[PDB]
Amino acid sequence: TGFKDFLLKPELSRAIIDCGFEHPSEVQQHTIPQSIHGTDVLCQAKSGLGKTAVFVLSTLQQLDPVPGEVAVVVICNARELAYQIRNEYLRFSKYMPDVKTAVFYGGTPISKDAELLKNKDTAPHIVVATPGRLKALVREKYIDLSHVKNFVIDECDKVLEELDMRRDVQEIFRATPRDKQVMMFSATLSQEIRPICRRFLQNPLEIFVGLQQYYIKLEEREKNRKLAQLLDDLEFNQVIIFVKSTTRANELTKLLNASNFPAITVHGHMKQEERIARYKAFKDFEKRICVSTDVFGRGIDIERINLAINYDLTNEADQYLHRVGRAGRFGTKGLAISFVSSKEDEEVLAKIQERFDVKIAEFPEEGIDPSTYL
Amino acid sequence: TGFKDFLLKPELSRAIIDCGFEHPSEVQQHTIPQSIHGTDVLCQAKSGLGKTAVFVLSTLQQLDPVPGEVAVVVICNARELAYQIRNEYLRFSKYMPDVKTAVFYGGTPISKDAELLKNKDTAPHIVVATPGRLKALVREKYIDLSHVKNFVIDECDKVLEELDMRRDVQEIFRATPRDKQVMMFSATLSQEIRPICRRFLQNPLEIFVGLQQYYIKLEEREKNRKLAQLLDDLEFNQVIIFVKSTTRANELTKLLNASNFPAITVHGHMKQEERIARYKAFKDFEKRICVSTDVFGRGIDIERINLAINYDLTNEADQYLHRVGRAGRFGTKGLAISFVSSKEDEEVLAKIQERFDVKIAEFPEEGIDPSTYL
């Protein structure tokens, strides 16, 4: 239990242990201890290495709940991301009954958010939101932000370069006390956006920047039968299958369900009500197979994924490393298999091995030992 | 026939007259005459003011076809845009039987492009392509670019800032003679991309930078019957109907098709194979009605749209001006009608009129004269 060295509340440490966390990532070791003191944070870390837990655990530790009073505000760029972030607040405030959280975004009647804000059972101490609706709550005085002590902007580079989101965020930022902690996070903080960020911070802490791999050389007409055989022989907990288009995702998923391989699919061109519903179905282990485009190529963390299959290879090596990264989370065991069915699959597979030193061996025809990836 | 003052081939001028062109836009007046001489061009012009006709008519005038020899190469960033550009070459080479053109992009077997390149009926003098596939044609020597005299990069700022496209484009650019004409076009040429552009030019010519509005105050349950009546009484060529959500787009479009109002819909939550298929169906006048979210609120240019209906009003005035801008393209006649069904429709309609000086009159109960918008 490495997080207990941060000297956090016993309710926090207990919830962190129920979430499977045992070793803090490097961004959390470099940010959490000094963020607890209320120091402003401008943080950059690579995709999926745990920036959410930084400001979630930090604000939850500084929080002392005052009833009916919003103390923490978190801003992101997308509605489902806000829903995801609020669900992380719920899981770490598991054993803090006094804490109440709410999320707000467009697409829902704003009158119901007003009622939820006044109710004594739902009056939130922590508010996650998208800039548009939260501004529509500040300006119609459905919410009071005169007591905010923690102001968080996630994906701050996108929030502050899009100018309609910047106006809303700055309107929200001017309803808060000036003597608050401000924290910003993004995997990409270019030299051109950092000066814009600094106009919200005051002397901030600035942080800047087991997987077995095989390939199979085959033809496109042989992918369906070889994949079905792979899923019958390999012993996996959950598998993610990456495809290069949405049409190939839906058609492959339809053939998997027809062949007694229960699978779901997530991609663009789909209603977000449906994208999230299947995301939760796969995340909560109702089906062991997920076919998706690069919409799940980065960041997604599902601990039961120990098999990633590149049904279609990527154009460049960087996306490949993020794809196979979905398996073997937190240095656990995993297995990655890529299909090489054309000329660029061979040059991109050729360009992956010099970049990372990995010899992506050809999948042996006799198969592999289950112990070598379990 | 203003284009005849450029002193172009009689076959070109004749095809230009069949395309309805009669007056050159300012970008074409400032670029075409000096581009005909083979002078390098770095051109910036606003969206939709005719940059395609600049390099299309210019290369077609300089072209003297040599059989089996590629003389002109055009690079864009998207596959459908390449298909669109090649179709513009077809329409202006209408009366030039010697000219042959081809387009190449991913998603198709590359062996068939090789066969099309060798065939004496299809060996192209002008090649439009996306950087990925054209590089895969140069490096496997399916195409010969040792004779290119005109090299065009459309949307050059996107082609050269994305680095996988820059590598491919520079690999293609090194298979061409160095003493060729190079032309680049984009609506956005920031100060940061122009030095990168100049490394391909040599002393280039550098060019840098009627709507009737009404509203109807009604209730939400009355929108369907009032819209159906509006589409039966008003005389429009094509109509765009803007909705605030994707669920309301699909349900409204389904009711329109049931009531003998053939319509299509484009929005998020949809497979992009399907989004584009309906975009082309509406753009090519197969159905006169399109229901969409703000995915078509900006930029989209369809000349037959003379009626825009705000079935759901926007949150802020800026998006309203872009929405109604889809009708009456290039200063032609148009008609805009917005539904006011709640309190903010009234304050946002209130805030539109001070910003733009327009008195958006209430739609008269007796209807409006067809002459006032035709």
| φ, ψ of residue B165 in degrees (nearest 5) | -70, -35
Cβ-nearest to B270 among A136, A269, A344: A269
Q: How many residue pairs bridge chain A and chain B with CB atoms within 8 Å of each other?
A: 45
Distance of CA A215 to the CA centre of its chain: 27
Residues B263 and B315 occupy one common structural domain? yes
Looking at the structure, tell me whether residues B171 and B42 fall in a common domain: yes
Residue A139 contacts B, CB cutoff 8 Å:
no
Structure tokens at B116: 């099309």
Cβ pair B273:A245 closer than 8 A? yes
The reply to whether residue B246 touches residue A274, judged by beta carbons under 8 angstroms, is no
Using a CB-CB cut-off of 8 Å, the residues of chain A touching B270 are 269-271
Tell me: do B197 and B217 sit in the same domain: no
Q: Give the separation between CA A350 and CA A347, rounded to whole angstroms.
A: 5
The domain of B275 spans: 212-374
Do both A122 and A243 map to the same domain? no
- Which residues are registered as beta bridge partners of A206? A42
What secondary structure letter does DSSP report for A6? G
Q: Among B245, B247, B272, select the one facing A246 at the smallest CB separation.
A: B272
Residue at A272: amino acid letter: Q
Token couple for A44 = 């950059």
Q: Measure the CA–CA gap between B113 and B334, rounded to whole angstroms.
A: 44
User: B143 and B15 in one domain?
Assistant: yes
A47 is in an annotated binding site: yes
- For residue A185, the tally of other CB atoms under 10 A from its CB is 25
Residues A160 and A86 in one domain: yes
Q: Pick from B164, B245, B315: which is nearest to A315 by CB?
A: B164
Element (H, E) at A181: strand A181-186
Same domain, A176 and A298: no
The chain A residue lying nearest B132, using CA atoms, is A315
Is there a single domain that holds both residue B187 and residue B75?
yes
Tokens of A264: 């779901």
Pick from B207, B234, B252: which residue ends a domain? Answer: B207
List binding-site positions of B for ATP: 45-52
Q: Which of B172, B192, B207 finishes a domain?
A: B207
Chain B: closest CA distance from residue A32 (Å): 35
Task: Specify whether A238 is located in the same domain as A281.
Answer: yes
Planar angle of CA B161, B167, B173, nearest 5 degrees? 105
A277 is in an annotated binding site: no
Contact assessment for residue B155 and residue B98, using Cβ atoms and an 8 Å cutoff = no
> Strands B238-242 and B205-207, how do they pair?
unpaired
Instruction: Verify that A219 and A301 share a domain, yes or no.
Output: yes
A22 at interface of B, judged by CB pairs closer than 8 A: no
- CA angle centred on A183, ends A178 and A187, rounded to 5°: 150
Taking only residues 276 to 335 of chain B, the set having a beta carbon closer than 8 angstroms to any beta carbon of chain A reads: 315-316
Nearest chain A alpha carbon to B137: A343
Residue A188, CA distances (Å) to A160, A335, B91 in order: 12, 29, 44
With beta carbons under 8 A apart, name residues in chain A contacting B275.
269
Nearest to B326 by CA among B228, B237, B234, B230: B237
Chain A residues closer than 8 Å to B265 by CB: none
Please indicate whether, in this complex, the C-beta atoms of A268 and B268 are within 8 angstroms of each other.
yes
8 Å CB contact of B246 and A270: no
Q: Backbone phi, then psi, for B54, in 5-degree steps?
A: -65, -60
Q: Which residue has the tokens 């106009």?
A: A199
Q: What are phi and psi of A82, to 5 degrees?
A: -60, -40
Q: Does A190 touch chain B (CB under 8 A)?
A: no
Output the six-digit token pair for B234: 């008003």
A26 and A169 together in one domain: yes
How many domains would you assign to chain B? Answer: 2
Asked if B115 has any chain A CB less than 8 Å from its own CB, the reply is: no
Cα separation, B315 vs B299, whole angstroms = 19
Breaks (C-N over 2.5 A) in chain A follow: 209
Q: For residue B158, how many C-alpha atoms fall within 13 Å in the half-sphere facing its CB?
A: 12
Domain boundary among A191, A207, A223: A207
* Whether residue A163 is found in the same domain as residue A217: no
How far is it, in rounded angstroms, from Cα B41 to Cα B59?
12
The helix (run of H) or strand (run of E) holding residue B170 is helix B163-173
Q: Which amino acid is at B72?
A: V
Inter-chain touch A272–B269, beta carbons under 8 Å: yes
Per the structure block, which two tokens stand in for A275?
Answer: 């994208």
Q: Looking at the DSSP assignment, which residues form a beta bridge with residue A305?
A: A238
Strand order of the β-sheet with B289-292 is: B263-266, B289-292, B238-242, B305-310, B334-340, B211-217, B361-362
